[PDB]
Each structure stands twice: as C-alpha cells, then as structure tokens.
Amino acid sequence: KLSEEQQHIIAILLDAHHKTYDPTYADFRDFRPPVRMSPLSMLPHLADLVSYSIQKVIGFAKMIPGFRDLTSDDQIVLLKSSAIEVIMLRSNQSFTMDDMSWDCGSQDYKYDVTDVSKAGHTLELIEPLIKFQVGLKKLNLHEEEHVLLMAICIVSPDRPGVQDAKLVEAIQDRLSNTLQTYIRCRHPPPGSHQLYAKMIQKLADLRSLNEEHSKQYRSLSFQPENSMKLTPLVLEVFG
C-alpha cells in the first residue's frame, strides 16, 4: 500500500510542477524572436527558452521535500549538474510523436531537428535526444511518475563536488521508494511491467546526454561571439 507520507509527497510534486510548468506557453512571446530563414539564427530564441526553463526548474527543486535541509553548496551543486537533464525530461510534454518535434501550440514555437541544429548542436547529441524522447513517450507514464522522476534526478548523491553524500542519498531514497510503491499499487499490468527499472535506465541515458551537451556547450561557449548570445543565468549555471 501507499503510505500517507508517500501520498503527501506525490501531491506536493504535482502541485510544484503545475505552478512551474505552463501548458499555454504564453510566456514564450517574451523571448527573442525565433529565426528560421544563417548560422545559429535559432540560438538567441533557444537560449532564452533554456534560461526561462532553468528558472522554472529551480522553483520546482525548492518544493521537493527535504531539499531545503541540504547546505546551500549542496543545493547549488545538484542544480548545476541536473539542470540540463531535467529540462530534457520536462520537455517531453511538448514533444509530439507524430511529427517527432516539440510542439508549443503554434507554428512559430514548434521545434524540429533542424531548429536544434540551428542552435549550434550536432546530430550526435540531437539523434540520441530524439531517441530518448520517443523512448520516454512510449512509457506513457502517469503524471505522478513524471514529476517523481524529475525529483529523483534533481537529488543525486553521485553528482561531482557534493559535500554531504549520505544526506542527499537519504532524501533520494524516500522519493525512489515512493515511486516503486506507487507503480505497484497505482499502475496496472501490462504497463507496470519493468517500469521502475526502465525509468531508472532513462536516468542513465540522461547522464550520457548531459556529458555530450556539456562538451558541445563548451565549444559553443568558447567562442566569444556565440557566448554573447547566452543569458547571464545560462553562463553561470551551465558554466
């Protein structure tokens, strides 16, 4: 059975996400206009979306039970390492199977493989990304599963530079144990079969995706001209 503390946790994460994620995508107008005519024409638009998204991820993180206990340094480290992975995760909701693109309800905010390429990212990142999206979409997780995964990703003991591994591990365990218990009680066969293990595997794919992005990000970031198009937050977070 789902313990009451576990049901509580789920309620909190769902709400956290509802506040942090806007289905309407109204806020997108505020970003620099998307340009699809021209190298890295997409980047200023795309860089603003990412910067926006980083903020939304930071807000979601704070709501997570026990995240507030961690030293400020340990909070910072967890956000810096996971922010790309979470953005990729949350981005699933916009991602459409039919067209293989991220659909933001409007033709102008629809995002395709060429758009991401127009950001200054090679197919090696891109092609694994699309594959991840498909593979995630196929799981067809409940909303409770989706929020829970993001929170378990955000709070990782392994992340480089962590001051207090043991305490971060304790907090993650509670959420993991909440997710396991939820699938068995709340998720029916045959969709329930292998779902925790499959979901865990997706965190591993994200780790690989994080490493690739980072290399690509540095070569992009290294050039002063491209670096000027990034937001201040993005520079600070992504380094």
């Binding site: 930071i58 807000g59 400020s72 909070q75 910072i76 810096k80 201040p232 937050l233 600070e236 977070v237």
Partner: peptide, 10 residues
C-alpha cells in the same frame, strides 16, 4: 562564486 543561483534558491 555563484550569485544568481544562490539568490533564486533563497
């Protein structure tokens, strides 16, 4: 070092 993150985390 990091300022913007610290402010947002509170």
């Amino acid at each position: 070092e990091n300022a913007l993150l610290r402010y947002l985390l509170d």
